[PDB]
Design a protein around this ligand. Structure first.
Ligand SMILES: CC(=O)N[C@@H]1[C@@H](O)[C@H](O[C@@H]2O[C@H](CO[C@]3(C(=O)O)C[C@H](O)[C@@H](NC(C)=O)[C@H]([C@H](O)[C@H](O)CO)O3)[C@H](O)[C@H](O)[C@H]2O)[C@@H](CO)O[C@H]1O
Ligand SMILES: CC(=O)N[C@@H]1[C@@H](O)[C@H](O[C@@H]2O[C@H](CO[C@]3(C(=O)O)C[C@H](O)[C@@H](NC(C)=O)[C@H]([C@H](O)[C@H](O)CO)O3)[C@H](O)[C@H](O)[C@H]2O)[C@@H](CO)O[C@H]1O
Ligand SMILES: CC(=O)N[C@H]1[C@H]([C@H](O)[C@H](O)CO)O[C@@](OC[C@H]2O[C@@H](O)[C@H](O)[C@@H](O)[C@H]2O)(C(=O)O)C[C@@H]1O
Ligand code: NAG
Ligand code: NAG
Ligand code: NAG
Lengths: 320, 148, 148, 319, 146, 319
């Protein structure tokens, strides 16, 4: 007796998927769509090495903390890597003004060319070679930030400084400077002679006048003094004009912003890994064609979409 | 139907014929084609709809910007929870549809054989059909072909 | 079913009778009324669900507020992408459910004619029935009416 | 002999998408996405917007001489400002908490400008030479209309002590500034006194500004700087100004007459002599659709915005 | 089927037999056990899926922080709208499935008896079958038993 | 004879909603939304909240005489402040970074107040004359308890130099202020020195304040102002104060003894003498529902908030 029947594919695939009203349901085929594995290291991003700051912070890098000499004139980078709590920061204690806003600009920048805008030899009526502190050691001795100069009085006098610099470059220029807050009236005249001092800084947008704040402070890295640092972007054809009769930590070097583009500041404890990748997270690089991953929320490059799912599998075949 | 057939590794849906000549399986290519397209359309459509998903960005705040630091945190976690929800919820719902979609194509294929031979064959109930005449291998292919 | 009838311009679902008297189309208002109410309840329910949707608002920041401006921009685009996703997804989902809804109403209506005349009519296969007795226009209306 | 079940079909060719099928032809379908705008700035429900043309908000409120068109404007539905307005602060400087003031202003529909300190009330100071080549007007040097740049009179600048008590029923937007000179010589030349201050106080405000001498790049030909401030003076509150130099004093202030829904639109369009229920910076919308993809920033009774290129619901069947 | 039976208070789905011995209702415990589990799984799945929902937090802002105050307000209300939408739409969609799921189980239970009694029974049309032979209570148990 | 298939029915009347059907009667419904609350403020898992009554956070911390209920409060689970507390800064002024302090306070469950600078330790200054009619108490002039308003003694106000070292293991919340007088005459009458400053330093803090002497509007009968500041003094750090006038010195500081999840709620409600696992500003919630629509500001183990008026899951069949 002749016959024909309708049936379907079955096999020994134990692989399971979930649905709205049915957990752990076995199917003949199932497509995983989530990537859970990473290579565990920090890589070049499509052939461009990152700037690994090791034990230095951004502030320590840019101001020129003596411990940070590896980073004096760094090459172009894809991303920047910094530790969560870096050792080499403001060696002389104090603060970096508008620091996180500076950092935010830095995540859109891929390369600096550091240039000398005020020579250390150019200070003829001030002492420019003794601005050092045991707070900033270098090879067993007192030193200081490399890109700014702590000037003091010369021959019991501090003449009023008037310096200008016109940015005759085609690029934007990050310019840094600071002020020293001394411990007391005696320190003030010992270092700068004049008891009442200021620092004027103007550009086309900046109109700044700083006065030192004397107070009695706890020792940080052996110092009760403080330095407060500032910055601005000096546009092509604008000029920055400094004036001061004391407490001025003057610019020596500044930074031409030579490459802008996609970048970021990752927090990571990892060191460089000698690998290349299309996708970096702070905890590992990723090499995948999956649409989703669950490694880390913060990534850069050609990456899949992050989810917090532990598991994500699509049903493809029939029930089994 | 009791269950699936392991003896058919040719495709997802098909037929098993029993004949004076012989007996063996045969996959339905027109019906399998429609399913591979409908599944491949779905999986790709899930990926493309999700590529507009939120991308988090590291933002740094100082110790007197705690409120906005928290706000920033809430906002980014918020979006990642939403999109995680959307990814999971879509997968669960898509799996339900995909399993029920394969079911539908077995019912519809069973009806086509019931319709193609209505009065020349009796339905048994277990997913089969007994001919009331002799159907040789060319005839059996005709039932698989569609022209009959 | 082979396909749709262009001849019918009365309603969505209906009958085409052939008779010794004559032959013509006739829409089932009972099933059609149910479909119009259903579809209209869906489209309005979709509009009114998307009433509670995010509104973008111009905020401005100076050039030392770049962090919060970016946070603002990402959160507004974030919600827009979410709601864009929701609108497009719900439409694709409702469209599929709507096409299957019209298929269901043809199966549900075909079974109603098969059950109404069980022993007094044969089933063909292409969405038709053959009477074993004479069914005039008033009899045909009785199949369309309900009482039979 | 035969009866059959069937369904509707027409020469439709209209297409829709689903989860597992795309490009599917149907008999009926409803578009729910508006994609068109009239491409112009209109009145919003019969109320004309404030179109600042080439003026910024600051240029308008301070009274930049190029912005005389807006000295006393009528009630508005919304404000339109260009991305980079040419007439901003003619004498260079800054507006303190400018973005916050713009925020307040998005909740305001109408001011009534009033005089509060006449130019002629200044007996012991020169109130009529406060001008600059940076603020031209009709061939000459001028200045912001709503504030007064006071300088010394007969080689003296007595200490100003002036109150204004808001005796009005309305909240009052008061504006003032401070002049930042180029050098000490300039300071004594305009104000006599070398060391100056501006104290300002209300019931909430307690401010003390000191001028900041620096060497600056010339902007609009000036190396000097004006820095402006503002406050909302409540009914029955008073504002007290004390100063011995560098004071840019209030002349006109703004009574807040109507609050309600508004916004500041960034747009390069001009007035389009039209009315609409719904405006974007790119053009107006007149639609009964639930969605649109014209622009995210709208005002009025608008549909909800999405980023979709296309949104069409199925209603009928396949073809 | 015309409608439901108030007489059957045993389970959700079942049979009403008519017989020479007697007549009464009988709930199918095989299909009712499957429906109780499917419903309990769906309600608990909805509760767990929404367990990662946004949580508004109180934040205070001063008079000159209106912009961020407004940002905060819209962000929180933005998330609360999204999760409200998510919750309501999921109930409506689950309800639709739940009602059709009950219809599905009636159709499948109907075909099981039609399949179990094919040649020795006639189908009526209103959800009933007519035996061509004598089916006592133990025979009727058999049809319920499967 | 015969057999028939069917399904359960009853007189349920209860309705659910679906994508294309409103009000659909089912035999078994499942509401999953709590709409009810007790309408009071309750203990959170057996810990009572700090109910500040008619006092603000600032009045509590500085020690406003009207807030003596809260001098030394026990551990709390959450804080409750009214929308507009009557007893804020009795002497008018401001609290610097007030919103950021309130945020930190929302991360804290307990303080232990200690005296860090006794009133009797000021040998060359008047400490028990720092009182004001703006801060009454039992019909006589008073002042904040936890800080001290020093004035001149014997027509002299020597330069103050006081350090305090946090020898405790707890972080210490320290509070001080500065007096902004009305005029020169009052300045010398109170402090003798016409030109004054307050220096404050820690390992992180570096502050120099100069009083603003100006004409202001009376608030609580005072044209003067007090401006308060705070810092968190870490274990083993010191805080050093130098001043020749206008100094409102610490007396008491707060040891941060415990931190956890807490919140500052705004509510008009009084204490409810009850206990809950989930509390909103308008009432507590004891429910097993997955959702609720009472209020979005919750603390404790709560359902998930939605704005929805109704959420009804269908479980049974139609009717
Ligand atoms: C001259 C001398 O004895 N120099 C060294 C000692 O200073 C040093 O002991 C440290 O003294 C610190 C303060 O001294 C400095 C410093 O910061 O290191 C010495 C700098 O020459 C001086 N720099 C300038 C430009 O003036 C600097 C400056 O005056 C202040 O930083 C301003 O605030 O002060 C400090 O007290 C440390 O705690 C202490 O160890 C000893 C030990 O290293 O060696 C001496 O060579
Ligand atoms: C010749 C002469 O003595 N004065 C005018 C020229 O200086 C002026 O050329 C412009 O001068 C600018 C600065 O001059 C002003 C100004 O801003 O226009 C002149 C104003 O009278 C003066 N206002 C007051 C109240 O004193 C103003 C003020 O002192 C400063 O702005 C304070 O910062 O300065 C500047 O140098 C430009 O580069 C230049 O174009 C000519 C215009 O041709 O008119 C002369 O009367
Ligand atoms: C510490 C001290 O001596 N406080 C004075 C105080 C100060 O001189 C002043 O507040 C500093 O800004 O002034 C007090 O008198 C002013 C007060 O007098 C009341 O009678 C009246 O109700 C108020 O309107 C006002 O005139 C004060 O009470 O604050 C006296 C106090 O001794
Ligand atoms: C800087 O130099 C350019 C070229 O000489 C000049 O045009 C410009 O005015 C200068 N900028 C300033 C601010 O002086
Ligand atoms: C302002 O004037 C009114 C009416 O004269 C008066 O009552 C009020 O106290 C004044 N306000 C101030 C702050 O002086
Ligand atoms: C505070 O006191 C401790 C114990 O005497 C001491 O070790 C520490 O250095 C002091 N800290 C400061 C900042 O003075």
């Amino acid at each position: 007796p002749d016959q024909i029947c309708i049936g379907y594919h079955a096999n020994n695939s134990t692989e399971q998927v979930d649905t709205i009203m049915e957990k752990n349901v076995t199917v003949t085929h199932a497509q995983d769509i989530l990537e859970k594995t990473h290579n565990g290291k920090l890589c070049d991003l499509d052939g461009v090495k990152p700037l690994i700051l090791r034990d230095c912070s951004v502030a320590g890098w840019l101001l020129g903390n003596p411990m940070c000499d590896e980073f004096l004139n760094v090459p172009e980078w894809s991303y920047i890597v910094e530790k969560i709590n870096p050792a080499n920061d403001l060696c002389y204690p104090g603060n970096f003004n508008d620091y996180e806003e500076l950092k935010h600009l830095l995540s859109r920048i891929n390369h600096f060319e550091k240039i000398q805008i005020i020579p250390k030899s150019s200070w003829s009526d001030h002492e420019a070679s003794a601005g050092v502190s045991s707070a900033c050691p270098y090879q067993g001795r007192s030193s200081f930030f490399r890109n700014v100069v702590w000037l003091i009085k010369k021959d019991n006098a501090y003449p009023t400084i008037k310096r200008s610099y016109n940015n005759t470059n085609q690029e934007d220029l990050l310019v840094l400077w600071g002020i020293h807050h001394p411990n007391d009236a005696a320190e003030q005249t010992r270092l700068y002679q004049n008891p009442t001092t200021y620092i004027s800084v103007g550009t086309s947008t900046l109109n700044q006048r700083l006065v030192p704040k004397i107070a009695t402070r706890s020792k940080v890295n052996g110092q009760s003094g403080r330095m407060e640092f500032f910055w601005t972007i000096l546009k092509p054809n604008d000029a920055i004009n400094f004036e001061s009769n004391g407490n001025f930590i003057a610019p020596e070097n500044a930074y031409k912003i030579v490459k802008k583009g996609d970048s970021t500041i990752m927090k990571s404890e990892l060191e460089y890994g000698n690998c290349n990748t299309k996708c970096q997270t702070p905890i590992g690089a990723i090499n995948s064609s999956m649409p989703f991953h669950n490694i880390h929320p913060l990534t850069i490059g050609e990456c899949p979409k992050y989810v917090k799912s532990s598991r994500l599998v699509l049903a493809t075949g029939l029930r089994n | 139907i009791e269950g699936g057939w392991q003896g058919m590794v040719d495709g997802w849906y098909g037929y098993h014929h029993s004949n004076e000549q012989g007996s063996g399986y045969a996959a339905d290519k027109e019906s399998t084609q429609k399913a591979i397209d409908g599944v491949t359309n779905k999986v790709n459509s899930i990926i493309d709809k999700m590529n507009t998903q939120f991308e988090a960005v590291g933002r740094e705040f100082n110790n007197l910007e705690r409120r906005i630091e928290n706000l920033n945190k809430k906002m980014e976690d918020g979006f990642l929870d939403v999109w995680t929800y959307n990814a999971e919820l879509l997968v669960l719902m898509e799996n339900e549809r995909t399993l029920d979609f394969h079911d539908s194509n077995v019912k519809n294929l069973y009806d086509k054989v019931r319709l193609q031979l209505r009065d020349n064959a009796k339905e048994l109930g277990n997913g089969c059909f007994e001919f009331y005449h002799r159907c040789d291998n060319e005839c059996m292919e005709s039932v698989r072909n569609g022209t009959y």
